Amino acid sequence: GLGYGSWEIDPKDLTFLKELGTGQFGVVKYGKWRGQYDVAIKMIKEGSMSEDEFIEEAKVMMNLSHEKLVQLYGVCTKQRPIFIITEYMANGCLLNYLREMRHRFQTQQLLEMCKDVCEAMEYLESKQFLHRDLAARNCLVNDQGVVKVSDFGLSRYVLDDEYTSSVGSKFPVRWSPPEVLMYSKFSSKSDIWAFGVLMWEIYSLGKMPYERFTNSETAEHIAQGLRLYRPHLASEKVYTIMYSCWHEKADERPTFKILLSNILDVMDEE
Numbered sequence: 001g002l003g004y005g006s007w008e009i010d011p012k013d014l015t016f017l018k019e020l021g022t023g024q025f026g027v028v029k030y031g032k033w034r035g036q037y038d039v040a041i042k043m044i045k046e047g048s049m050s051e052d053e054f055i056e057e058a059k060v061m062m063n064l065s066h067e068k069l070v071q072l073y074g075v076c077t078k079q080r081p082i083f084i085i086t087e088y089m090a091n092g093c094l095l096n097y098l099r100e101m102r103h104r105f106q107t108q109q110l111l112e113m114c115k116d117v118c119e120a121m122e123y124l125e126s127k128q129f130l131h132r133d134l135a136a137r138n139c140l141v142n143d144q145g146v147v148k149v150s151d152f153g154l155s156r157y158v159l160d161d162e163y164t165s166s167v168g169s170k171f172p173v174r175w176s177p178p179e180v181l182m183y184s185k186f187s188s189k190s191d192i193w194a195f196g197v198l199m200w201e202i203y204s205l206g207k208m209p210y211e212r213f214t215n216s217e218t219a220e221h222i223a224q225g226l227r228l229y230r231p232h233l234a235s236e237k238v239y240t241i242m243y244s245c246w247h248e249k250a251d252e253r254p255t256f257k258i259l260l261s262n263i264l265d266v267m268d269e270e
């Protein structure tokens with residue numbers, strides 16, 4: 001079924017309805033399962049992912065369950081290419097959504113976007129599960145405007161060298177703490193740093209972080225102490241939250257449990 005029963009999904013139950021575009025692994029489609037339930041269908045371009053390791057990890061991913069996590073429904077592996085079937089998010093990726101100026105977001109909405117993501121990351125942290133590529137491009141938005149974290153942990157199976165090398169052109173340099181860029185030290189605290197950059201993206205309505213700097217200049221400057229400026233839409237109290245994620249010492253960065261509590265404190269003042 002879809003989240004029930006076998007997680008090997010029979011592709012004969014799928015109807016393709018619309019092309020959603022292409023992402024890290026190629027073609028993504030919108031469709032229906034057994035004519036009724038909406039799904040997204042990720043078709044995994046051959047040569048782009050470490051499929052055996054992913055399919056093993058998919059067992060772990062099926063056991064994760066949180067409202068603010070894009071649900072993995074299952075896989076279609078008896079065919080070329082394989083398919084990954086997930087929850088459908090009608091409003092697309094958070095980054096594009098932020099950049100659509102027609103929404104005319106209130107800051108109350110932006111704050112709740114941060115809360116949705118932080119809830120999902122608190123859940124993952126309680127499960128000792130790192131995201132490893134948290135960013136607005138990796139969050140999705142459903143028809144109710146709820147933001148959900150997607151593709152958690154998937155960077156471990158990407159085969160593209162430009163994404164894997166810390167100096168590759170596709171590595172998430174602008175979402176990485178210094179200990180990642182200099183030593184490849186990943187931890188919950190590198191996810192924390194990325195969450196700070198994500199809050200900044202949200203309150204900047206989707207601007208690219210450190211836009212005036214190249215990837216190399218960014219890596220050098222944040223390791224010296226350059227930090228992202230406060231976005232105009234972020235109050236001092238909101239900026240303190242995102243800023244706290246960027247401490248130069250990883251153990252001085254908060255947990256996601258603390259960040260959620262800080263976000264709720266600001267929310268509760270409204």
Ligand SMILES: CN1CCN(C(=O)[C@H]2CCc3c([nH]c4c(C(N)=O)cc(F)c(N5CCC[C@@H](N6CCN(C)C6=O)C5)c34)C2)CC1
Binds near residue numbers: 028039093
């Ligand atoms: C006209 N109507 C039908 C479709 N509409 C959308 O907005 C769709 C945008 C993409 C998208 C939607 N869902 C998803 C899901 C999902 N699990 O649901 C997973 C994905 F992995 C998506 N993407 C693939 C390409 C690259 C990237 N991109 C590239 C550009 N973009 C916005 C984006 O998200 C992400 C989408 C909804 C508008 C309303």
Ligand SMILES: [Cl-]
Binds near residue numbers: 203204230233
């Ligand atoms: Cl700004």
